[PDB]
Structures are given as structure tokens and as C-alpha cells.
RNA sequence: CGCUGCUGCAGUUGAAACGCCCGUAGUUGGCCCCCCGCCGCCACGAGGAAACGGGAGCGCUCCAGGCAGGCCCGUUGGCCC
RNA sequence: CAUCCGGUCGAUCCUGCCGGAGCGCGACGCUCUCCCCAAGGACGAAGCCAUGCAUGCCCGCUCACCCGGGACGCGGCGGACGGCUCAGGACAACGGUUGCACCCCCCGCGGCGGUCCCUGCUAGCCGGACACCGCUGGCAACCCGGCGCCAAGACGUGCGCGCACGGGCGCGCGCCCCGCGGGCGAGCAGCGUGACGCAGCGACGGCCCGCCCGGGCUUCCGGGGCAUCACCCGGUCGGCGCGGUCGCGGCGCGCCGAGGGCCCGACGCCUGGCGGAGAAUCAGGGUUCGACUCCGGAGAGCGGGCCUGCGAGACGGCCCGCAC
């Protein structure tokens, strides 16, 4: 019965609004499919939900891995995907390991370790590439699109975010 | 840089990684001149404000009716109340009754706004519950020019 | 809908039971007469292995049939009792040379419509690219001015 | 409100079809297609009522059930298939050819045309779309879907045979132009001016042949020949007969009656 | 029924000036600058269904009707709301 | 389309209302010679219902039948349109006016039409898997069981060109701004570039695109009474990060502030409140009424909740709580 209909909301004047209609199908809402990071992969089940007009949406509910891109060198590769670090809206969601765009995550450096040989390719991603995990944030809507692609964090977002989570 | 702000903000239209180097093909902000003869403000061109809801430097696009009204309230952050004075004609008695309609407008930091000033609003996809209008120009007045019910 | 539980109980008025492995001492009624199977396979693939042609596999066998032969049993409507209309399943999954021609017709048509499009794009590509350079031939004059 | 409506009441029906108020609870409803609902007329009425060929609505469906009627050079048989502006409709059993035109009052009129006139069709160019994998495309007033030096509002002379661009009537001041919508439908005049206003609803000013500057919306403007009508004009030349000039015609008609 | 009063009602005595005064909203504000800018205002367009009200044309035998009819505006069914 | 007369006194002139006088539209009494036209269980009971009917149409397969006469089931389309009634709903609905650069849309119409595979292929083009129907059976009824068998333009699989390609990506214009397009009033598009996915449709090519017909919302102005209702609201008001949706949005969630409304009447309450197109009465101005024809809403005893579908939060669908 979830709905985004405005009828159930009060007015600007804080006034109750008469309910002129029963909930309608067009204004319907569906359960948030919380994409869940698998963590160790040793399953990606992605659902497909019928929409309005017989369209389709892919709902990620559990998945690991996914395409990532190093914007500074403009090289793009699939990555294993490690634990979510930071959620910017909740500290519980990070520990739960739910995936949603804007949630910063660690990634394995092994696919992108090929740039350690190269030199002066920034300095921050050089130290993450040397390290097991790379700081990266998600750029895809895991629940609506069904994929969780992301961009490796580079420059200022990485600077502010590192300070936000890593130091104790 | 702060310790109190929970989430980092940038422009989706700009690239944060780009800012690290190449001091040639470098742009500070993805601002575009608005149509309907709207000049992009200079404060907006040289402006370090993220403003996703900025008409000039943000995803917001101005399409629809464009109105002109006074500034009634500005207590909200990045939002002002535009009082729209107007006249209603009665036919049973041939006189006009004065009316007032308050409208909510998202204001960019490029606009510095004080009460009693007159703002030129424009239509926007609803930004919030009460905000379907964005400011495209702000005109100040000396001190408080009284009120005088002006249907601008 | 109300349903009885799968585990059986004495309560059920009736049940149903099917031989999995047949015993000796064949029953007078349960095991003896094989009810004549009817509804002869119509599938061509089924017909190929059913009529001793599986080895032929892809083949123009065309017509092999086992059919009921007791007239048609609806000859009373024809009003002629002494007739023997064939009682046969129409072949299913049949392949004809018109079917082959139909595949070739549509494959020629798909290729033809695709080919016409490919050549046309190159012609329009010239129109636009040449037009931008042709505009340059005009822009020469203001510089002369 | 549930799903799409599939009925059109007689009072709901547009005035141009001129379907009698009584005798019928509901008029026929057009199908989604080349022309719009109030921008097109039904094919059944054009034969059943306008020409009186079909005694009943059903016996109009019978006539095209077996192919016997064509729109824009294509069989286009469906009874309520929309037949709209500048349509080449030809009855080959009657051996007659008729462009569907707008009368000065504004109603649709079937006007007989030559085989050369049947050879070409006029349709306005809607805004160019950039879809279909980057191949440039543009739609018509008949929805049919190119030449690079063309803009919106201009009329393409699609042959219906080649199914390709032929003579493109560019939208510029002074072209002899027809009015598709508004009160002065059917009137023909050169476009005196255009005021865009850089917002929406560009103003249209039209000098007629007799010096009366009629006006309409810029969307409702149809080009009819870059120079010269380039079509079979019904014998009114969009002169706008006045209500008294119409009473003269009617009274002489009654005299002849 | 101008006995609801915008047009257009009454309050000395038939019903009815607050006992008096300050006063915020409200409403109302002498003249005065010609020459533009926003107002309001007024005219003119454009665009947005009919039925309906009006109205052209018409003998339903007359009519209330109807958009018919007639040896025909490209027969009509305009045009206004 | 501008009209009065009767009624306070012994008479008089006033104010003042009473009563007549005309019309409409319902009851009600008495009567009606026809012909034509015609409303019709709205009116404090959206109360309850016996009975019969109100959505079917075709074969895509036909092995029965029996000459394509062709049932029976599956298959496709329609059953959301149509009919009904105003219960609810008072910045709502409804109307004019706008916007979707914030979107969804079957049929139809006019077009595009390279579909990777490792492979695995039967691609001269494939599978298994069931209704129907037999064969035995239950049940008081309703309703269905098991067996055995066979079909489909049903469904499942499947070759198929690296401008393969649905999606979602990361990266690709700028120098105070303002003037060319594939563009527009406006950085919108459509791609190139580097990845991912392997979406469709393909066993009788449609993937897909536009037009359009509707929606989904949205802008602006209009949008009942009551002060014996003067103070209201607390997702309420802004911002931020997500989700969720066809999509924008407090639309849901966290987070962060402190708003948003009001004597130009807010909020609260009430309404024998559907709204307009219109209707009645009438010099002019007003007044009065909007059940029903047209349109838009909203509902199908009452609340909820749902799948199917291109579209219904459907009730001549289903499911549950509450009545009866």
C-alpha cells in the first residue's frame, strides 16, 4: 500500500487535507530493495520488477564486484569491491554493508595495481594502489538500475573523506 | 574544509579529479547563461557555492511562467518568501479588493537578499514541498520603502 | 481453496495409486490389456525417430503415417455410409521448399533493406560534410571585405 | 481514470464534422494514427454522409472491407481511420481524386484534383528529431518521417511514390500560406510578419490578397507553395466571404431552388 | 421589494451615531513635473468543444420541431456567445 | 423588455411590514376528445435485495467431428471503454491558463532495421509439456482429483555483422557575459573515449524511433458558511544525503537548522457541500439553483491490501478485517 501521493501530507498552513480518493496505482511505491554487499564472495542475486507501461527495472539485493573507473588516468576496469566505508547519512548503514549511490567503499587494488609501475600518476591513488584497498565512491543507483558501478575517489572528495573516516 | 559538515558537496557538472592539474583547460564552475534574456551574474561566475538548486550554476533549468514580487521573509536558508500583491475585481460592486499571495523561492548565494527588496522569480521543477519557483534577479530598494501594496 | 493434507489418512473417501515396479501374479484387470494408444505423434521431429528414420535426421521424408481407418464415423452427415475418409493427425513441424524460400525471401529482404540504408548513410554523410566545407567557400568573402 | 477512452459522443464530436445532434447518441471516434482527433475527419462520414455513398455506417465498412478506397496512395482502408489535411483520397471505382482541404468556414471539403495533383502531397515539417541512432529525422502533419537545409513549419512536397523530400517550401515572410487552425481556417494569404517574443506562441501576421491582415498562431500555419499555391485550391481562394456575402449566395441558391 | 440598497435604503422624532477620547491594522488621502519605467486602467488581437442562448436559411399540412432541403455557395447548416 | 393594488384611523399623511398580482417545478385534489413532443424512485435511505438478463469475438492449433460445415479446450484481442449515482471531497475537486530541460502511453500511422558469445547449434529452422480428450473417481452441493495420451503464430531454448548493443556508468564546450547549429528563449541532444551487462527478439523480425490519442502531475487566477472559531502546524517549514516512483517533490528515511501560516480572517468547526458548461426569474444591476444529457472529478455495503495487464490500487477480478 506504499504511496508517494501528496494527499496524505498536510498543507503549508499545517492543515489536514480531505481524502478525496483511495490510494491509486500510479502513485504507488515499492519496498526499498537494500542492495547488500556480499563481503567475501566465496551471491549476486539481482531481481527484475515490472513497472508502469510494462517497463522493467533491475533491483540489486545482494551483489559484490562491478565496473569502476580511475578518472585521473581515465582507465576503467571491473573491481572485486570490498567493505563500504562511510554512508554520509547513517553510521549504521556502513556496518550493515547496504550499498547505495554516494556510499564510499574500499575496492581491491589488484586489477588497478598495474599503474604502480607508472610514476607521477597523482600521489593519493599511488598509495592506495600500493595498499590492498582503494577509496572509491558509488556512482550508480544499485537498487533502481541493478548495477553498482563507481568512480575511484580522486583529489578533494578523497581528501575530505579520508579525514572523515580513517583517523582515530 | 570543516569537521562539522557530514557530507562533501561538489558540482556533478564539474569534475573534482580534474582540479588536481592541467592549469589550462580548467573551469571553476559549470554555469550557463539562462535564456529569456537573463544575464548570468558576475558573482555567480566567480562564485564558490555548490548550489545544486542554483538556476545559473546548478542542475535547475528555468522553464515556465516568470513573475516579479516583493521580499516578505528570508529566514529559511537558501529560500525567501515572495509576497505577490494583486487586485481582485468585484462586479456586484465595481470596486477592487486588495489580495496578497506568498510564494516560496529558492535563492542562490549569488543573490544577497534583504526584506523590502523586489525579486524577479522564475518557474522551476518543484525543488521542495512549497518551492516551484527560483530567483533569476534581485533588485534592492533604499532602507525600507514602506509597503504600498505594489502589484509589481 | 480448502485442500486435504498430503500425508494420507483413513478419513479420505478415495485415493489414487500407481504401480512403480510391477510384481508377479499379474492382476486380471490391473495388468493385461494395453488400452490402444491413439493421438499419433504429429511432430516431424517425433515422426523422424518414430517411423524408423532417426538416422535420416534432416531429410525430405515428407509423408509417413499410421492412421485410424474405421471410415470417419461422421459420414452420417455426408449421408453416404459406404465411405472411408482418412483419420490422420495433420503433420506438424513440416518443412517445405516454400519454407526455405520464405527464409531466403525474408533474409534477402532484410539484407536488401539493410543494404539500401548503409549506402544512403554515406550519401548523406557527404552532403553534411561537404556542406560545412562549402559554407567555408562562402566565409572566404567576408575576409576579403 | 482507469484506461484510454474509446468512444466520442455526438455533442463531444468537433463542430467541423457537422454530425446532426439528434439521430445519434455518439459520433464515430478516429484511430490513433497519421492525423489527430480534432485535426482529422472520419473516413466513414466522407463516404457515408458527405458523399452519401453508404446508406448505413456498417455499409461503409463493407465498401472498404474489400479494397476499394485509398488515402495518400496507400489502401488505408480502416473505416474510422483518420483522414486529415492535404490527403490524396481517390475512389478508383468512381474514378475521382480529392484533396481533403479546409473550407473558409473551417469545415473539411473534398475538392476534385488532377492526376498530377494526386502525384504529390503537402505536409508541414514538425521539429527535427535527432533520434534513431543519430540519423537526422523530421515528422510531418501526417506523422510520416532527410534534407539538411530545412527548418520546422516549412512544407515538404512528399511524393507518396518516392516517399522522399521533393520541393521544400521554406517558412519565410511573403510565401502564400494556408491557415490550418483558429477561427479563420481555409483563408489563404502571404505571411506579412512574425513576432517571436523569445518565449512561446510566436505571433503570426498575414496579409491576405485583398489587403485584410488576418492573424493566427504560428503552429497552426501551413505552407502552400513557396511561390504560388502549388495545389488545387477550392474555388474560394480563401477570400473570407462575409455573413452578408453568404446570405447573398444562400438567397440566390434558394432562387435557383 | 430601492422591504438588502454597487446602481439604490435608512438612523432628530417610525428600528437605528458606539457616553467620551487616543489609537494599530484597514480604508481614504491638497495641489504639483507633460513626454520613460513598472503599475493598475482602456481598447485591439491571438488561442482555447459542442449542446445551450441568440440568429441566417428552410413550409414538420400548421406548430412545439428539425438542420434540413432542393432540379442546388464546392446546396446549406453562417455568425456571435 | 423600467407598472402596482388591498390591510393601523373618526378621517388624513407617513414609516413599516402583512396579503394579493405574474412566472418557473414538484407534490396534491378534481376532471381530460384526439394528434404530436416529452421528464420520469435525485430530493436527511451511496438503505437492502428474490428472479432473468447487462462482454464477448474469433480460430493460432482441429486427430474428435467431418469436408473445411467445423465444435471442445488452450491461444490471441477486448472485458479499465460502456451503463449507473453524487456518497465523499471546502487553498481540494472543478473551470480558464501553463509547464514537463521532472515524465509514462497498447492499438494504429510513418519510419529504422549489423544483436558479442567461449560456444553450443537442428537452424532446410529445435525442444518438453500440458490442457482437451479418453480411463477410473470423489463430494449433499460447490468444486475438483489421479491415471494415460497428444497439439499450437502457446511457452521454453537457439545460430545472428565488434557504429556488436537495452540499461546504468567514468571521461570528454567554455575565460566577465551576450549573439551559428541537429537544435532551443536557455549545457539540450546525440555521440566519440575507456569500461561493464549480455537486456531484447529468434524457431512466420522485432528490436526500436517519432507523430498522435489519452493519462501522471504541474503553473497562474478564480475557487461556501461561521469570530458564540484569534491564534495555528509540528514532516509542519527550509536545507542536505539517500532511497522510492513512470517521474518532480517531505513522497518515505536519516541528518541539519528554525521555520511556515494569519483581522487582505489563518487555523479550527460545520455543510439536507459534486464542480463547471449551464438552469430559473427577469428594464439595468442583481438574485437563485447547480442529482441527471456535455465535460471533468469520485465511488461502487464499509475499511484496507493485491495480482493480471499497455493501462485498474478494478469490485458484473481476487484476498482479508468489519457488518448484513
Amino acid at each position: 500500500g506504499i504511496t508517494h501521493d501528496k494527499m496524505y501530507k498536510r498543507s503549508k498552513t499545517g492543515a489536514v487535507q480531505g481524502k478525496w480518493h483511495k490510494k491509486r496505482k500510479y502513485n504507488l511505491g515499492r519496498q526499498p530493495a537494500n542492495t547488500k554487499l556480499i563481503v567475501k564472495v566465496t551471491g549476486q542475486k539481482i531481481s527484475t520488477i515490472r513497472c508502469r507501461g510494462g517497463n522493467i527495472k533491475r533491483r540489486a539485493l545482494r551483489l559484490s564486484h562491478g565496473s569502476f573507473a580511475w578518472g585521473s588516468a581515465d582507465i576503467s576496469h571491473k573491481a572485486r569491491i570490498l567493505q563500504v566505508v562511510y554512508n554520509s547519512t547513517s553510521n549504521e548503514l556502513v556496518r550493515t554493508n547496504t550499498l547505495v549511490k554516494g556510499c564510499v567503499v574500499q575496492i581491491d587494488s589488484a586489477p588497478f595495481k598495474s599503474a604502480l609501475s607508472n610514476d607521477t600518476l597523482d600521489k593519493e591513488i599511488l598509495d592506495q594502489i600500493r595498499g590492498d584497498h582503494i577509496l572509491a565512491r558509488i556512482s550508480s543507483r544499485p537498487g533502481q538500475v541493478g548495477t553498482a558501478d563507481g568512480y575511484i575517489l580522486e583529489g578533494p572528495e578523497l581528501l575530505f573523506y579520508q579525514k572523515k573516516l580513517a583517523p582515530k | 574544509e570543516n569537521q562539522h559538515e557530514r557530507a562533501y558537496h561538489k558540482q556533478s557538472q564539474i569534475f573534482q579529479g580534474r582540479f588536481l592539474r592541467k592549469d589550462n583547460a580548467r573551469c571553476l564552475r559549470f554555469y550557463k547563461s539562462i535564456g529569456m534574456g537573463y544575464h548570468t551574474p558576475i558573482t555567480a561566475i566567480n562564485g564558490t557555492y555548490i548550489d545544486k538548486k542554483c538556476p545559473f550554476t546548478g542542475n535547475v533549468s528555468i522553464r515556465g511562467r516568470i513573475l516579479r514580487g516583493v521580499v516578505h521573509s528570508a529566514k529559511m536558508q537558501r529560500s525567501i518568501i515572495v509576497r505577490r500583491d494583486y487586485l481582485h475585481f468585484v462586479q456586484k460592486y465595481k470596486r477592487y479588493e486588495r489580495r496578497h499571495k506568498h510564494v516560496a523561492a529558492h535563492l542562490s548565494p549569488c543573490f544577497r537578499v534583504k526584506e523590502g527588496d523586489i525579486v524577479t522569480i522564475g518557474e522551476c521543477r518543484p525543488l521542495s514541498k512549497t518551492i516551484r519557483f527560483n530567483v533569476i534577479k534581485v533588485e534592492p530598494v533604499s532602507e525600507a520603502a514602506k509597503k504600498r501594496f505594489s502589484p509589481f | 481453496k480448502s485442500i486435504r493434507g498430503c500425508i494420507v489418512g483413513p478419513d479420505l473417501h478415495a485415493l489414487s495409486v500407481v504401480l512403480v515396479d510391477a510384481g508377479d501374479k499379474t492382476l486380471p484387470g490391473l495388468t493385461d490389456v494395453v488400452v490402444p494408444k491413439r493421438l499419433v505423434p504429429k511432430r516431424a521431429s517425433k515422426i523422424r525417430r518414430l517411423f524408423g528414420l532417426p538416422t535420416t535426421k534432416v531429410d525430405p521424408k515428407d509423408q509417413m503415417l499410421v492412421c485410424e481407418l474405421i471410415k470417419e464415423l461422421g459420414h452420417e452427415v455426408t449421408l453416404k455410409n459406404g465411405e472411408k475418409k482418412l483419420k490422420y493427425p495433420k503433420v506438424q513441424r513440416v518443412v517445405t521448399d516454400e519454407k526455405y524460400a520464405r527464409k531466403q525471401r525474408v533474409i534477402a529482404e532484410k539484407k536488401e533493406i539493410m543494404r539500401k540504408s548503409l549506402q544512403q548513410l554515406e550519401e548523406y554523410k557527404a552532403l553534411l560534410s561537404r556542406m560545412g566545407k562549402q559554407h567555408n567557400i562562402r566565409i572566404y568573402k567576408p575576409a576579403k571585405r | 481514470a482507469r484506461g484510454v477512452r474509446k468512444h466520442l459522443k455526438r455533442l463531444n464530436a468537433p463542430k467541423h464534422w457537422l454530425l446532426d445532434k439528434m439521430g445519434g447518441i455518439w459520433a464515430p471516434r478516429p484511430t490513433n494514427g497519421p492525423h489527430g482527433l480534432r485535426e482529422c475527419i472520419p473516413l466513414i462520414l466522407i463516404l457515408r454522409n458527405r458523399l452519401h455513398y453508404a446508406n448505413t455506417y456498417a455499409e461503409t465498412s463493407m465498401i472498404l472491407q474489400d479494397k476499394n478506397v485509398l488515402i495518400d496512395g496507400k489502401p488505408r482502408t480502416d473505416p474510422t481511420f483518420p483522414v486529415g489535411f492535404m490527403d490524396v483520397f481517390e475512389i478508383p471505382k468512381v474514378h475521382k481524386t480529392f484533396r481533403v482541404l479546409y473550407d473558409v468556414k473551417g469545415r473539411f471539403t473534398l475538392v476534385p484534383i488532377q492526376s498530377n495533383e494526386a502525384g504529390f502531397k503537402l505536409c508541414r515539417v514538425q521539429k527535427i528529431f535527432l533520434g534513431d541512432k543519430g540519423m537526422p529525422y523530421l515528422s510531418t502533419h501526417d506523422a510520416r518521417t532527410p534534407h539538411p537545409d530545412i527548418k520546422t513549419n516549412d512544407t515538404i512536397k512528399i511524393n507518396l511514390k518516392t516517399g522522399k523530400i521533393d520541393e521544400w517550401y521554406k517558412f519565410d515572410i511573403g510565401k502564400i500560406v494556408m491557415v490550418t487552425g483558429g477561427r479563420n481556417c481555409g483563408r489563404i494569404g502571404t505571411i506579412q510578419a512574425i513576432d517571436k517574443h523569445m518565449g512561446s506562441y510566436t505571433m503570426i501576421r498575414m496579409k491576405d490578397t485583398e489587403g485584410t491582415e488576418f492573424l493566427t498562431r504560428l503552429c497552426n500555419v501551413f505552407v502552400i507553395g513557396n511561390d504560388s499555391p502549388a495545389v488545387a485550391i477550392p474555388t474560394t481562394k480563401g477570400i473570407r466571404p462575409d455573413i452578408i456575402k453568404n446570405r447573398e449566395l444562400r438567397l440566390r441558391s434558394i432562387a435557383k431552388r
Side-chain angles (χ1 to χ4, degrees):
Chain A
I2 336 187
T3 26
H4 46 82
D5 214 298
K6 224 162 55 166
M7 206 188 19
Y8 304 105
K9 172 99 22 252
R10 267 189 211 247
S11 76
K12 9 175 311 175
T13 79
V16 213
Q17 254 80 74
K19 304 303 183 236
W20 40 293
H21 67 264
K22 319 188 123 118
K23 336 199 134 203
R24 247 71 177 266
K25 171 80 182 10
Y26 22 91
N27 285 0
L28 106 145
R30 296 180 183 106
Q31 258 186 264
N34 271 12
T35 309
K36 267 299 223 293
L37 170 76
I38 283 308
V39 188
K40 55 124 228 76
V41 84
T42 339
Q44 320 188 13
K45 182 176 135 141
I46 319 284
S47 263
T48 26
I49 56 118
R50 165 134 198 197
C51 283
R52 196 120 136 99
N55 295 141
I56 209 83
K57 235 180 224 173
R58 294 212 346 214
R59 299 236 83 83
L61 48 111
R62 264 163 30 237
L63 120 133
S64 241
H65 294 60
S67 238
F68 261 84
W70 180 335
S72 330
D74 250 352
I75 36 146
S76 321
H77 306 295
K78 181 108 151 282
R80 109 117 280 158
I81 293 212
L82 300 175
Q83 306 262 51
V84 176
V85 62
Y86 220 75
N87 229 103
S88 121
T89 159
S90 149
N91 206 253
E92 301 79 64
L93 245 77
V94 188
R95 130 211 358 161
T96 328
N97 278 280
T98 103
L99 281 164
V100 263
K101 189 183 54 59
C103 88
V104 203
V105 307
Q106 299 279 70
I107 33 166
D108 65 331
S109 319
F112 288 86
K113 242 155 204 128
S114 35
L116 203 39
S117 55
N118 231 26
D119 29 71
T120 84
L121 215 23
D122 217 355
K123 214 37 114 340
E124 22 256 270
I125 343 230
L126 275 202
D127 324 315
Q128 275 134 68
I129 272 345
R130 213 137 0 139
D132 74 289
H133 31 50
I134 338 172
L135 258 156
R137 184 218 98 164
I138 303 275
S139 85
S140 171
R141 289 211 102 180
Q144 258 90 21
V145 334
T147 339
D149 333 277
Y151 60 101
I152 304 197
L153 268 206
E154 31 232 348
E157 9 203 9
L158 168 135
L159 174 80
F160 178 89
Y161 278 144
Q162 127 225 274
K163 293 159 168 5
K164 274 328 127 127
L165 33 104
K168 214 211 143 221
Chain B
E1 197 38 66
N2 36 30
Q3 219 7 266
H4 54 79
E5 137 207 325
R6 260 160 120 258
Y8 172 77
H9 303 133
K10 45 133 201 228
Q11 205 182 2
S12 45
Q13 300 165 264
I14 224 61
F15 182 33
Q16 276 328 285
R18 246 198 28 224
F19 286 123
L20 260 15
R21 247 338 274 130
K22 224 238 211 77
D23 37 37
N24 336 89
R26 253 354 151 239
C27 18
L28 189 73
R29 196 101 300 216
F30 201 120
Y31 56 92
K32 219 257 138 327
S33 128
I34 297 311
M36 306 293 210
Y38 259 108
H39 221 138
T40 355
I42 171 78
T43 153
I45 286 141
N46 284 338
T48 168
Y49 61 80
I50 294 106
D51 218 0
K52 50 130 169 222
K53 320 180 132 352
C54 189
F56 303 98
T57 84
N59 304 70
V60 156
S61 122
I62 299 272
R63 125 244 26 106
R65 245 199 236 83
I66 284 129
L67 306 174
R68 17 158 344 153
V70 226
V71 175
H72 194 91
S73 227
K75 345 272 311 138
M76 320 128 101
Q77 111 250 52
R78 288 234 179 119
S79 293
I80 153 226
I81 288 311
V82 177
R83 186 183 78 248
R84 299 246 311 155
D85 293 313
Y86 64 101
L87 271 181
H88 183 244
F89 181 59
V90 189
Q91 292 109 83
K92 196 206 163 23
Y93 319 102
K94 287 90 44 154
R95 332 280 211 281
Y96 288 85
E97 37 158 327
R98 315 190 142 126
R99 316 277 210 93
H100 84 272
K101 173 135 4 161
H102 288 170
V103 122
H106 163 87
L107 93 112
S108 147
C110 79
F111 304 119
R112 283 233 41 163
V113 180
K114 181 233 331 148
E115 330 278 3
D117 298 351
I118 307 125
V119 273
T120 8
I121 8 149
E123 216 144 276
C124 171
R125 50 172 168 284
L127 252 14
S128 82
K129 164 64 170 320
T130 76
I131 308 216
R132 270 106 204 91
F133 264 78
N134 216 306
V135 189
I136 2 191
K137 203 44 113 172
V138 49
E139 311 95 67
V141 87
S142 60
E143 75 259 311
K146 326 193 55 131
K147 210 231 237 90
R148 290 231 158 84
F149 173 71
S150 335
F152 280 111
Chain C
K1 303 219 72 214
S2 61
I3 35 106
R4 190 34 184 69
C6 182
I7 351 236
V8 115
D11 50 88
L12 284 106
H13 229 301
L15 1 147
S16 222
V17 93
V18 167
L19 249 179
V20 228
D21 174 72
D24 2 291
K25 310 120 9 237
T26 104
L27 255 112
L30 167 70
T31 142
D32 60 315
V33 38
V34 182
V35 157
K37 261 88 163 300
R38 31 223 248 269
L39 296 184
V40 241
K42 3 187 2 191
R43 201 163 334 266
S45 302
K46 272 197 102 170
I47 275 166
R48 119 204 3 211
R49 344 240 108 218
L50 238 273
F51 284 95
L53 344 130
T55 7
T56 82
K57 233 264 107 217
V58 181
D59 228 39
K61 28 128 259 110
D62 308 321
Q63 189 45 246
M64 0 278 327
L65 175 92
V66 250
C67 32
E68 339 125 54
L69 36 114
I70 3 131
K71 328 124 224 356
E72 84 178 354
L73 247 51
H75 271 313
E76 261 94 311
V77 179
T78 94
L79 275 122
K80 249 296 297 308
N81 268 356
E83 254 157 13
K84 214 83 36 228
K85 211 38 96 235
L86 203 60
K87 293 159 116 343
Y88 73 106
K90 187 244 203 96
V91 205
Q92 245 322 300
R93 205 157 286 216
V94 230
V95 29
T96 155
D97 286 54
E98 154 75 358
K99 183 193 242 183
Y100 193 54
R102 270 173 169 270
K103 153 181 241 105
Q104 255 63 59
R105 198 159 288 113
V106 305
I107 247 164
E109 267 139 6
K110 158 98 182 242
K111 263 139 238 202
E112 162 96 20
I113 71 211
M114 249 266 308
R115 182 227 55 245
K116 99 203 1 153
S117 301
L118 292 159
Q119 313 155 301
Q120 273 148 13
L121 287 161
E122 303 143 12
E123 302 322 289
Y124 178 71
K125 266 156 141 107
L127 261 133
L128 204 42
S129 315
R130 178 228 43 194
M131 248 184 26
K133 121 228 171 155
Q134 261 177 327
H135 220 168
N136 271 46
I137 319 290
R138 280 128 178 160
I139 216 176
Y140 162 61
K141 177 209 181 118
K144 137 182 62 168
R145 289 181 236 157
Chain D
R2 297 293 279 279
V4 193
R5 227 91 153 142
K6 235 330 247 102
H7 285 69
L8 227 222
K9 289 277 195 166
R10 196 77 130 221
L11 295 191
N12 215 9
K15 236 338 219 335
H16 83 267
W17 307 5
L18 271 162
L19 268 137
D20 59 329
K21 170 222 324 188
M22 327 247 350
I25 344 96
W26 28 37
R29 166 146 266 228
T31 96
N32 222 351
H35 288 271
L37 208 115
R38 30 188 29 155
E39 307 108 278
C40 83
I41 231 170
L43 176 58
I44 155 245
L45 154 112
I46 256 180
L47 304 145
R48 132 111 255 251
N49 273 139
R50 289 197 29 104
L51 262 40
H52 272 321
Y53 268 61
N55 285 336
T56 107
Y57 137 79
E59 272 50 70
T60 331
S61 178
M62 232 314 181
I63 87 182
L64 31 96
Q65 240 199 344
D66 12 277
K67 251 352 268 134
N68 274 295
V69 261
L70 276 101
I71 322 264
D72 296 317
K74 304 239 347 218
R76 298 297 115 241
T77 143
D78 193 276
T80 190
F81 155 85
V83 40
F85 208 29
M86 327 295 308
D87 272 4
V88 181
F89 156 71
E90 62 110 9
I91 358 191
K93 256 321 246 324
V94 191
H95 338 105
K96 277 233 228 112
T97 5
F98 305 96
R99 262 316 227 273
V100 206
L101 244 294
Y102 269 140
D103 119 276
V104 252
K105 291 127 223 220
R107 333 137 165 200
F108 265 123
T109 150
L110 275 190
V111 36
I113 66 189
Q114 285 81 55
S115 312
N116 323 317
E117 281 287 323
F120 68 90
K121 192 220 142 88
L122 290 194
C123 24
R124 189 227 120 142
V125 167
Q126 259 66 25
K127 178 87 222 342
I128 323 208
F129 48 112
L130 242 224
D132 301 269
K133 291 246 265 255
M135 304 166 55
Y137 264 56
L138 34 105
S139 211
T140 60
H141 88 340
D142 78 287
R144 168 146 12 213
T145 51
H147 163 76
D149 275 354
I150 254 163
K151 298 295 161 268
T152 108
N153 246 325
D154 113 85
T155 280
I156 47 134
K157 216 201 27 83
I158 206 125
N159 259 10
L160 302 165
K161 331 274 129 252
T162 72
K164 241 97 168 355
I165 5 117
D166 298 282
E167 238 49 78
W168 32 89
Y169 305 139
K170 311 289 291 292
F171 203 68
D172 242 351
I173 276 150
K175 309 318 183 138
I176 151 115
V177 115
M178 256 224 52
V179 164
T180 339
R183 17 162 116 242
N184 32 63
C185 290
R187 233 241 259 234
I188 346 245
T190 122
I191 13 195
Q192 175 109 268
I194 20 113
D195 263 349
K196 325 276 306 151
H197 308 303
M198 273 202 11
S200 64
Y201 313 124
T202 288
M203 229 2 236
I204 267 262
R205 316 208 307 135
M206 237 143 351
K207 42 153 5 109
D208 113 288
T209 41
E210 327 289 302
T212 105
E213 227 255 42
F214 69 120
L215 311 108
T216 190
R217 273 248 178 101
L218 130 124
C219 47
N220 305 332
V221 173
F222 185 61
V223 195
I224 194 126
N226 234 188
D227 234 286
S228 265
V231 96
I233 302 273
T235 164
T236 177
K237 314 307 147 206
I239 222 115
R240 193 119 321 260
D242 230 317
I243 72 180
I244 169 78
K245 214 202 134 46
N246 244 183
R247 209 191 86 82
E248 321 275 20
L249 285 151
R250 181 103 300 253
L251 253 239
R252 276 109 38 74
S253 164
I254 299 282
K256 285 124 51 178
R257 132 185 143 123

